[PDB]
Amino acid sequence: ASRYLTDMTLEEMSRDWFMLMPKQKVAGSLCIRMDQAIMDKNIILKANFSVIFDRLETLILLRAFTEEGAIVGEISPLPSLPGHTDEDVKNAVGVLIGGLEANDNTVRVSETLQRFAWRS
Amino acid sequence: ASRYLTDMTLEEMSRDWFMLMPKQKVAGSLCIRMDQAIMDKNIILKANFSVIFDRLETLILLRAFTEEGAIVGEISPLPSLPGHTDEDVKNAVGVLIGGLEANDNTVRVSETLQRFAWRS
Numbered sequence: 463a464s465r466y467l468t469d470m471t472l473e474e475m476s477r478d479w480f481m482l483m484p485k486q487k488v489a490g491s492l493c494i495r496m497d498q499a500i501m502d503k504n505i506i507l508k509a510n511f512s513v514i515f516d517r518l519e520t521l522i523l524l525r526a527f528t529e530e531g532a533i534v535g536e537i538s539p540l541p542s543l544p545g546h547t548d549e550d551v552k553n554a555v556g557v558l559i560g561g562l563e564a565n566d567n568t569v570r571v572s573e574t575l576q577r578f579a580w581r582s
Numbered sequence: 583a584s585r586y587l588t589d590m591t592l593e594e595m596s597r598d599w600f601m602l603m604p605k606q607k608v609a610g611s612l613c614i615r616m617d618q619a620i621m622d623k624n625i626i627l628k629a630n631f632s633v634i635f636d637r638l639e640t641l642i643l644l645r646a647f648t649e650e651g652a653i654v655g656e657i658s659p660l661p662s663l664p665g666h667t668d669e670d671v672k673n674a675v676g677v678l679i680g681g682l683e684a685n686d687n688t689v690r691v692s693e694t695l696q697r698f699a700w701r702s
Contacts, residue, residue, distance in 0.1 A: 465694065467587050472630070472643070476596050510592075523592075574585060 466522060468510035469572040475510060475523060479533035487557055490550025491543040494557050496526065496535035501565040503528045505535075507555065508572045518578045521551045526558065526569070535562065552579070586642060588630035589692040595630060595643060599653035609677060610670030611663050616646065616655035616681050623648045625655070625682055627675065627691045631698065638698045641671045646682065646689070655682060672699065 468475065483498035510522040526535030537554045539546065546554075555575070562569045571579075588595065602619035625646050632639040646655030657674050659666060675695070682689045691699075 463589065463693065464591075465587065465589055466591070467585060467633070469583070469585050471586070472592075472595055475592055513587075573583065 465513050466510055467513045467518065467574060468522075469508035469574050470510060470523075470525065474508070474525065474527070474531075474533075477533060479536070485561060487561075488540070489554045489557050491539060491546040492521070492537050492550055492554040493540050494535075494537050494554050494561075496558060496561050498561075498565065500528070500534045500562070500567060503534070503567045505562055505567050505569045506572060507535075507558070507569065507575055509575050509578070511574060511578065518574070518581060521546065521578075524555070524558075524575075526562065548578075584632045584634060584639070586630055587633045587638065587694060588642075589628035589694050590630060590643075590645065594628070594645065594647070597653065599656075601654075605681070607677065608660070609674055611660050611666040612641075612670055612674040613658050613660060614656075614674050614678055615658075616678060618685065620648070620652075620654045620682070620687060621685045623654070623687045625687050625689045627655075627678070627689065627695055629692060629695050629698070631694060638694070638701055641666070641698075644675070644678075644695070646678065668698075 481497040485496050485498045487494040505526050507526050509524040512519040524537040535558050559569050601617040605618045607614045627646050629644040630642040644657040645653050655678050679689050
């Protein structure tokens with residue numbers, strides 16, 4: 463029996479999105495996508511993690527949202543690749559944040575990612 | 583900010599399902615559905631809850647699954663009549679369990695539902 467803790471609504475996680483000006487990268491075992499067309503916005507990163515004994519375990523899905531609620535980036539596992547580590551997640555988030563910040567966006571991370579950043 | 587804690591995968595929560603023999607009922611601002619055709623199966627109730635300060639807040643979605651993974655029951659909030667109580671939820675779960683058990687199914691609930699049953 464697994465469990466999942468997420469910042470996102472079901473609709474936020476299921477919603478289709480695509481990039482005006484796609485930028486993709488792959489760091490670790492994680493696909494990183496973001497829209498290069500997004501500039502001068504406030505963005506929040508929200509995540510869905512699996513959880514074991516109240517401890518965050520594995521990143522399932524991360525999406526970047528503007529204030530209008532639009533999706534502008536995503537970090538997700540590739541099915542055809544093995545599992546990722548904590549440092550793979552932190553590296554991937556750092557790539558997404560740096561990409562967004564290069565277009566003068568202000569990015570903050572959700573409470574759940576804030577706990578994942580340091581948790582033993 | 584509200585987060586969500588769930589026993590279900592994204593696919594499990596978004597999958598379309600239908601009753602061979604539809605049975606539908608409303609109690610306490612909650613819509614209860616179950617397939618009257620299902621008998622002699624092993625069923626687990628899984629749920630999605632909002633969470634505030636590590637405390638389970640409100641039921642978002644409950645679905646009943648056979649060992650094989652078929653959805654055979656659901657409890658969901660009414661679209662625009664929010665505000666169901668803890669007692670409303672427990673009563674709706676009891677109605678669903680009693681209905682499934684009267685068709686000779688064995689029913690158990692997820693650890694998240696079990697926590698919600700008692701939490702102050």
